[PDB]
Design an enzyme around this catalytic site. Structure first.
Site, PDB file in Angstrom:
ATOM      1  N   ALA A  38      45.306 -10.426  33.950  1.00 35.44           N
ATOM      2  CA  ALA A  38      44.398 -11.551  33.814  1.00 35.44           C
ATOM      3  C   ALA A  38      43.335 -11.463  34.902  1.00 35.44           C
ATOM      4  CB  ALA A  38      45.167 -12.869  33.916  1.00 35.44           C
ATOM      5  N   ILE A  41      40.157 -15.141  40.163  1.00 41.68           N
ATOM      6  CA  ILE A  41      39.134 -15.575  41.113  1.00 41.68           C
ATOM      7  C   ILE A  41      39.522 -15.031  42.483  1.00 41.68           C
ATOM      8  CG2 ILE A  41      38.231 -17.561  42.374  1.00 41.68           C
ATOM      9  CD1 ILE A  41      36.910 -17.021  39.669  1.00 41.68           C
ATOM     10  N   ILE A  44      40.564 -15.142  49.703  1.00 42.27           N
ATOM     11  CA  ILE A  44      40.179 -14.612  51.005  1.00 42.27           C
ATOM     12  C   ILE A  44      41.260 -13.658  51.499  1.00 42.27           C
ATOM     13  CG2 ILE A  44      41.025 -16.776  52.033  1.00 42.27           C
ATOM     14  CD1 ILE A  44      39.154 -16.288  54.376  1.00 42.27           C
ATOM     15  N   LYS A  78      48.616  -0.086  63.412  1.00 41.89           N
ATOM     16  CA  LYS A  78      49.709  -0.969  63.805  1.00 41.89           C
ATOM     17  C   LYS A  78      50.825  -0.156  64.438  1.00 41.89           C
ATOM     18  CE  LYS A  78      53.490  -3.791  62.088  1.00 41.89           C
ATOM     19  NZ  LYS A  78      54.274  -4.164  60.845  1.00 41.89           N
ATOM     20  N   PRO A 110      58.605  -1.924  68.115  1.00 41.82           N
ATOM     21  CA  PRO A 110      57.741  -0.787  67.784  1.00 41.82           C
ATOM     22  C   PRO A 110      58.413   0.153  66.802  1.00 41.82           C
ATOM     23  CG  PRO A 110      58.411  -0.812  70.132  1.00 41.82           C
ATOM     24  CD  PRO A 110      59.347  -1.689  69.357  1.00 41.82           C
TER      25      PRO A 110
END
Length: 526
Positions: A38, A41, A44, A78, A110
């Site tokens: 689909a 929209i 962010i 990262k 880490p």
């Protein structure tokens, strides 16, 4: 020929387009692949963090160079998750408070490997010194050179792109999805149908035969992958497979998130994800170039949406009335079975936990890897289906327990939320591991080294001794006493002192010689 001929994938995003691209390669163009998505929209880009095998296990399998996809999704580097204020009370703050013993309340998780001496991990020599009052160093800085590199915000590669440490990625997940959609469509003959689903057509046994779209087109298929998200439109709604809610292990069920413009040149770029403890959950910080994504994960039984929004806003000095937010209610847990008849669920339609250890994309790749391995023909051998399901549930429950240990062993008791975490039942597997840890023993020793950790080697050894030490010791849970064998091994203690000294030398050297994460990113994206 009794093979699957057509695979229909319901839903796009990272789950649908990772599935489409991966199966496009794994099935060597012997199968037609259709993605029904689909149109959506745009939201962010609130950022997504990952773990180091993403490039080897997924992009390399597809032949996609690291820098090529990175430059298309604003990706950054990262080296850890950095946990902030998980031991001290008070309001959410990006700045770490001070413990009663004078240490700052931060610890790192880490990706680096732990060396051993005399077959005993460096963690155990550290714990002996710490318990005996012989060191004031924290576990993470004593045992990983990466800690010093992250404290200086240096990059995991030199400017000539030579590797200095292990690392994973921060990125904009919608841009990764769009990148993979373009790849699957232009390079793998995937058919992209932009439409909504209206009907699921089934045979007398309840196997799916086709999906009808809103325009009325019928998409026939032999195997269907549910990537429709939390709604599980195929696996839960049409197939009626029950979802197992696991809020009795993890309380957080909501998030409010946004993207914050960042002054990289004034502040530099952190080569890590931050997990900032809040009064009713935690907030992620996922740096990218020019901005960091951020989201407050919380339990809506302990904060309202407005309460969580205001505390999230105050964290970054945001105007809560003049900033664009994304709100979401989570589904925490997993289906009773991930794969039912000819319907295989992947991603959020299969299972979900909060992104406290950056495992979401990993659950997707692991499922598609296991699907390719267990790929059926039209007889749908029930042993294939059962072994696939067994892998998904054991993967999920193991990471679920690991996440619960972050909350259960936090010393915080200053809000109803932090106290409610300690009323939950601890899973038996963690009770066992904690008892092992407290006797001084290692917890799940790793089997391989840097390189092999080979998808099977990692999948079977996912959370190892190093990971349990990072979280237990980071939160202040210590063994009751040193590993008793150490009392018999003066030469092994001396040998571990030299390892500690190598970690210092390497971190010192690299802190001096590496470029800033900011400078490496400018070169990569410039």
């Amino acid at each position: 020929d009794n093979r699957i001929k057509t695979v229909v994938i319901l839903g796009g995003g990272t789950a649908g387009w990772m599935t489409a691209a991966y199966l496009g390669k794994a099935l060597q163009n012997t199968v037609k692949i259709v993605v029904l998505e689909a149109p959506t929209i745009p939201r962010i880009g609130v950022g997504e963090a990952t773990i180091p095998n993403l490039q080897r296990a997924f992009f390399d399998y597809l032949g996609i160079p690291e820098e090529e996809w990175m430059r298309e999704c604003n990706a950054s580097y990262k080296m850890a998750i950095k946990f902030i204020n998980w031991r001290t009370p008070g309001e959410g703050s990006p700045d770490p408070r001070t413990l009663d013993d004078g240490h700052t309340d931060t610890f790192h998780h880490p990706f680096g490997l732990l060396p051993s001496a005399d077959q005993i991990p460096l963690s155990h020599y550290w714990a002996a010194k710490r318990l005996q009052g012989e060191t004031d160093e924290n576990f993470d800085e004593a045992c990983f050179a990466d800690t010093a590199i992250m404290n200086a915000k240096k990059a995991p590669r030199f400017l000539d792109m030579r590797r200095a440490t292990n690392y994973a990625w921060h990125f904009d997940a919608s841009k990764v999805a769009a990148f993979l959609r373009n790849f699957a469509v232009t390079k793998q003959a995937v058919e992209h149908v932009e439409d909504e689903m209206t009907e699921v057509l089934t045979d007398e046994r309840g196997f799916i035969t086709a999906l009808r779209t809103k325009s009325g087109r019928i998409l026939q298929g032999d195997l269907f992958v549910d990537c429709s998200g939390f709604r599980g439109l195929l696996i839960n709604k049409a197939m009626e497979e029950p979802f197992i809610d696991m809020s009795d292990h993890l309380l957080c069920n909501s998030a409010v998130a946004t993207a914050v413009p960042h002054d990289d040149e004034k502040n530099g770029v952190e080569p890590y994800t931050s997990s900032i403890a809040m009064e009713a959950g935690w907030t992620w910080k996922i740096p990218m170039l020019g901005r960091f994504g951020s989201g407050h994960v919380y339990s809506d039984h302990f904060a309202t949406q407005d309460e969580a929004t205001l505390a999230f806003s105050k964290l970054w000095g945001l105007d809560p009335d003049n900033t664009e937010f994304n709100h979401v209610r989570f589904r925490v847990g997993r289906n009773r079975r991930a794969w039912v008849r000819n319907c295989v669920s992947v991603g959020l339609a299969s299972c979900f936990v909060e992104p406290l250890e950056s495992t979401g994309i990993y659950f997707i790749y692991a499922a598609i890897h296991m699907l390719a391995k267990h790929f059926p023909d039209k007889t749908f051998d029930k042993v294939l289906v059962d072994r696939f399901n067994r892998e998904i549930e054991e993967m999920f429950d193991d990471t679920r327990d690991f996440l619960q240990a972050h909350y259960y062993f936090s010393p915080r008791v200053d809000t109803p939320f932090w106290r409610a975490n300690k009323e939950l039942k601890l899973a038996d597997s963690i009770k066992d591991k904690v008892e092992t840890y407290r006797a001084g023993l290692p917890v799940n020793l790793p089997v391989t080294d840097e390189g092999t950790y080979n998808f099977e080697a990692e999948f079977r050894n996912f959370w190892t001794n190093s990971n349990y030490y990072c979280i237990f010791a980071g939160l202040g849970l210590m063994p009751r006493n040193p590993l008793p064998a150490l009392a018999y091994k003066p030469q092994s203690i001396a040998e571990a002192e030299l390892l500690f000294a190598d970690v210092k030398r390497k971190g010192d050297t690299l802190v001096e010689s590496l470029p800033s994460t900011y400078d490496l990113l400018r070169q990569l994206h410039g």
